[PDB]
Design a protein around this ligand. Structure first.
Ligand code: CE3
Length: 262
């Protein structure tokens, strides 16, 4: 183990939970992993895969993002900050993607999942871009149950870091679609206390958070440091008590550790 991994282990010990980290440094294509091949509940970080899958569809259906989708009262779930403003109205697939990614709207995520034919359609897209680990099994809100040991709606930090790299810096998506995803991630509103809080303020960051039961608190980010090659960082955290409070500070701390030297 390296000093980085040792610091992450110490953070984990003090936190009382289980911490998973994967950093990809595109400068030399190296990876730093902590519990990198253990499965963790994704919660809302899975919204990146769903939005990306719809972007992929739009590469051959060029008007798809503009397609209005009906929002019915019965569609609302447990957290619908944007969709609730469109009950008995519509949101386009672009608007649903922005809401799911930038506000972590759960109704918006369910519409993306439906557009893909269900959770299996999101998983199928993951497989198509070379992610053999990701699995989406449920819709919102049950995909965030985060039960210890439950393989449903999980991935590993290594796999999610590799996929996030391919989606944003690589070419799993077409050029316009890649840029659109990056724009959405950069404009996220929910990440100020997570990875962003542990990085220098001059660094540009795009991220997607997630949260669930068992105090599950997650963040995945693409990072552009000042005058250096970009990084991808996944920080997953989950706890023993079903009713544990969120711990965004732990993600900020992991980011602070990872940033040393970069
Ligand atoms: C059964 O589902 N339980 C959830 C849940 O809906 N998580 C989802 C997820 O991931 N989300 C994020 C997210 O991206 O972190 C926030 C972010 O919240 C805010 C106010 O920005 C809004 S809720 C949504 C849950 C358990 S604890 C918590 N906050 N949510």
């Amino acid at each position: 183990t390296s000093a980085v991994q040792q610091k992450l282990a110490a953070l984990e010990k003090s936190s009382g939970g289980r911490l998973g980290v994967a950093l990809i440094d595109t400068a030399d294509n190296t990876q730093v992993l902590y519990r990198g091949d253990e499965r963790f509940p994704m919660c809302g970080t899975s919204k990146v895969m769903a939005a990306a899958a719809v972007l992929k569809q739009s590469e051959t259906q060029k008007q798809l993002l503009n397609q209005p989708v009906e929002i019915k009262p019965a569609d609302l779930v447990n957290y619908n900050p944007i969709a609730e403003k469109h009950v008995n109205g519509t949101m386009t697939l672009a608007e649903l993607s922005a809401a799911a990614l930038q506000y972590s709207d759960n109704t918006a995520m369910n519409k993306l999942i439906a557009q893909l034919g269900g959770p299996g359609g999101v998983t199928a897209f993951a497989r198509a871009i070379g992610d053999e680990t990701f699995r989406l099994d449920r819709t919102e809100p049950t995909l965030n149950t985060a039960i210890p040991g439950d393989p449903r709606d999980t991935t590993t930090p290594r796999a999610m870091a590799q996929t996030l790299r391919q989606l944003t810096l690589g070419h799993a998506l077409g050029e316009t679609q890649r840029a659109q995803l990056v724009t959405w991630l950069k404009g996220n509103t929910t990440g100020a206390a997570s990875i962003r809080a542990g990085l220098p303020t001059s660094w540009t960051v795009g991220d997607k958070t997630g949260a669930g039961d068992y105090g599950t608190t997650n963040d995945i980010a693409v990072i552009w440091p000042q005058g250096r090659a970009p990084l991808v960082l996944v920080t997953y955290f989950t706890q023993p008590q079903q009713n544990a409070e969120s711990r965004a500070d732990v993600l900020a701390s992991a980011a602070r550790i990872i940033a040393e030297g970069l």
